[PDB]
């Protein structure tokens, strides 16, 4: 069944949960654009972040696990043949989001997979190195001008390499949903006070 593999596997949020997350992400993009902490550092980044990221996910929001490219991607077949992948296909999950983030290229949500969910994370250089398994897991909320969504995962890894050693620094804002951190280079992270739960289905997208 190699030739019948999807473009990618992942957790695809339901219609209702995709909308709840989309709205939460839009609220963040507008809160952030109007924080003077953010305004100060536009040299490093009025800018309306909602329009800036007006390359929309042409579909439901999702957390990709394995890019397969219909079986041409490296490791596509070994991922998809796993028993846990077959048995999880079509099943319902409630995933945890711990933070929202923005860079000059992407806007996203950080997904904190549990040990059990990591079984669906696929089995590196020096951007995922030293970080826990599955740290790349994210939901893209928007991309800038010419950016493709694969970039969102690389941007989150870069941010998390900072958080690793407390380079996150002191908070520069205390929003009702969490504290706001300026990581420099136009990088921003809202650490949510309480995790967001999103309902999703593990499945595959064929383009």
């Amino acid at each position: 069944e190699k030739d019948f593999l999807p473009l990618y596997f992942g957790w695809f949020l339901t219609k209702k949960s995709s909308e709840t997350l989309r709205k939460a992400g839009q609220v963040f993009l507008e809160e952030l654009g109007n924080h003077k902490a953010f305004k100060k550092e536009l040299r490093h980044f009025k800018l309306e972040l909602v329009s800036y990221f007006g390359k929309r996910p042409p579909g439901v929001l999702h957390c990709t696990t394995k890019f397969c490219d219909y079986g041409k991607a490296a490791g596509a077949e070994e991922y998809a043949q796993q028993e846990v992948v077959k048995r999880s296909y079509g099943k319902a999950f409630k995933l945890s989001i711990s933070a929202l983030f923005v860079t000059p290229k992407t806007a996203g949500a950080q997904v904190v997979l549990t040990d059990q969910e990591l079984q669906l994370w696929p089995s590196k250089p020096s951007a995922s190195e030293g970080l826990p398994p599955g740290s790349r897991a994210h939901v893209t909320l928007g991309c800038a001008a010419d950016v493709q969504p694969v970039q969102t995962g690389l941007d989150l890894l870069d941010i998390l390499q900072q958080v690793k050693g407390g380079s996150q620094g002191e908070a520069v804002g205390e929003l009702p949903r969490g504290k706001l951190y300026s990581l420099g280079k136009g990088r921003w992270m809202l650490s949510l006070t309480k995790k967001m739960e999103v309902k999703a289905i593990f499945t595959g997208y064929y383009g």
Partner: nanobody
Amino acid sequence: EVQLEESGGGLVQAGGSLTLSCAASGFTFDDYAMGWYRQAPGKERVGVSCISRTDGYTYYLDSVKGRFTISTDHAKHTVYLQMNNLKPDDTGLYYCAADADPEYGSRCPDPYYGMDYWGKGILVTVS
């Protein structure tokens, strides 16, 4: 504020049939999911059957497939579980469940993940 009211359980001889019913009060919209979970002696609660009111899509635990049928009455906001050819292994506390997300709840998610709303449970004893 949603409330789930269960009925239809009790004692039945092996090979018999029961129909469980659960009425949901307090939902403000039609597009939600309802289903049934069972706790057998010594075991954790497990999804038995779930349904999406609008789509009608159904999930069945493999051990009940063919024997149990789930259905809804739209106007009455009630779900029904028709249990035929009952076996002693079907004994347990049966719990109605509902969830506001019809796509999530209609898949009978594991209780690890959960459902938004739960009934109190009704006993089915198959002798």
